[PDB]
Design a protein around this ligand. Structure first.
Ligand SMILES: C[S@@+](CC[C@H](N)C(=O)[O-])C[C@H]1O[C@@H](n2cnc3c(N)ncnc32)[C@H](O)[C@@H]1O
Length: 390
């Protein structure tokens, strides 16, 4: 009733902008919710099946260099595309038609094809096309394998390095997800490039005031400022310190697995001044004691509650009474949004989960900590949960 009226107004409005950053996303959500309302189950399942055929056509046409063979502007015949890529024109045509019917491609006349704004990213190698490939190659098989997986392993939340849904779907339940993706650096390459999209997002500086850390940096000129626990390449630490002279990158500690820390070293320019580099295992005792801030960003969602309590317990033991622990993770609403529920199930294929603030509270308290506050990013659920010793 009412929601149809609301969306209908957001439809009239955006029709004259054709002739507002929140305005785009209030309309994409309303269109989805309206679609769900008008739709009955039979239309739902036809829509679902169409999504699977569409991603399959996307995957094949990328793989076969068809999007490359279509000029970014102007038209080209199906015959000319098929000769360029050396493929049966009938098969090119049937798969292209899927994307024409869904608006990803545009057909001109009876025999010519052209790119749209929605298909051009697939014409080259980049984070978006890497995400498409990874979704199809690394997540869909695991999803389709979940019915058999839960009959095989029991119908409970899956956790643990071995016997992931992913490894089960690959025929190799004994191997870890790292071993699987590392045994074909072409696969690792698409995984790495795809994660480049979301490495920029949700910057910690500007969302969290570190002035209070500056005052600590002066009042104690010796103590470690910010320890980035599992910080990968240390980009979060860099952004924090970049143009803050009172927060010196040289006073911070980047921690990760020794193989990751070694790669950080081997890819730094000579005089580039960096934080301290420390290879370690955060399932073990925290080597740096009494830092002002411990940061653990996008690590806890990979693990069970019990493993998270062990990880956080090591940080709490190493923290001082005035220390702060910052957990950077999605905080699910109850119920969660569409993209975070989707990521929650994707994480289940590799032994992880997303969590509500209640689930984080249980884990944090078990580690001898307490939640002092939460800074949530605007327009999403990614947050920094500020914790202190209990
Ligand atoms: C999802 S990445 C997060 C990287 C970074 N914090 C960020 O926000 O982008 C998880 C990181 O944890 C590291 N890691 C995994 N297991 C670890 C362990 N046992 N000890 C230390 N680091 C670990 C990985 O090497 C990886 O850099």
């Amino acid at each position: 009733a009412d929601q149809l009226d609301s969306l209908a107004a957001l439809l009239t409005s955006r029709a004259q902008a054709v002739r507002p950053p929140q305005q785009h996303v209030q309309l994409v959500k309303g269109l989805k919710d309206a679609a769900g309302l008008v739709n009955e189950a039979r239309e739902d399942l036809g829509d679902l099946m169409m999504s699977f055929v569409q991603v399959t056509a996307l995957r094949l046409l990328i793989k076969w260099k068809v999007f490359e063979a279509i000029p970014l502007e102007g038209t080209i015949s199906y015959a000319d595309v098929a000769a360029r890529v050396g493929i049966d024109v009938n098969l090119i045509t049937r798969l292209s038609w899927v994307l024409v019917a869904t608006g990803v491609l545009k057909q001109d006349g009876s025999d010519k094809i052209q790119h749209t704004a929605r298909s051009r990213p697939y014409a080259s190698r980049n984070p978006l096309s890497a995400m498409m490939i990874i979704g199809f190659d690394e997540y869909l098989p695991a999803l389709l394998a979940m019915p058999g997986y839960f009959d095989t392993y029991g119908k409970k939340e899956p956790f643990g390095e071995k016997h992931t849904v992913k490894a089960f779907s690959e025929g190799n339940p004994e191997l870890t997800v790292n071993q699987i993706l590392a045994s074909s650096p072409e696969r690792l390459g698409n995984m790495t490039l795809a994660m480049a999209a979301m490495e920029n997002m949700y910057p910690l500086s500007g969302v969290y005031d570190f002035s209070w850390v500056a005052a600590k940096a002066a009042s104690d000129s010796n103590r470690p400022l910010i320890v980035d626990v599992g910080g990968a390449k240390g980009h979060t630490l860099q952004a924090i310190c970049k143009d803050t002279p009172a927060l010196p990158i040289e006073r911070c500690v980047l921690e990760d697995l020794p193989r990751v820390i070694q790669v950080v070293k081997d890819t730094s320019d000579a005089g580039a001044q960096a934080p301290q580099l420390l290879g370690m295992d955060f399932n073990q005792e925290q080597p740096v004691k009494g830092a002002v801030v411990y940061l653990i960003r996008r690590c806890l969602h990979d693990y069970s509650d019990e493993q998270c309590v062990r990880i956080l317990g090591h940080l709490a033991a190493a923290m001082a009474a005035d220390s702060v622990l910052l957990i950077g993770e999605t905080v699910l609403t109850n119920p969660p949004s569409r993209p975070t529920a989707m990521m929650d199930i994707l994480l289940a294929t590799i032994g992880g989960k997303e969590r509500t603030i209640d689930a984080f509270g249980a884990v944090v308290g078990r580690a001898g900590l307490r939640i002092k506050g939460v800074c949530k990013q605007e327009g999403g659920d990614f947050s920094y949960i500020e914790c202190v010793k209990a």
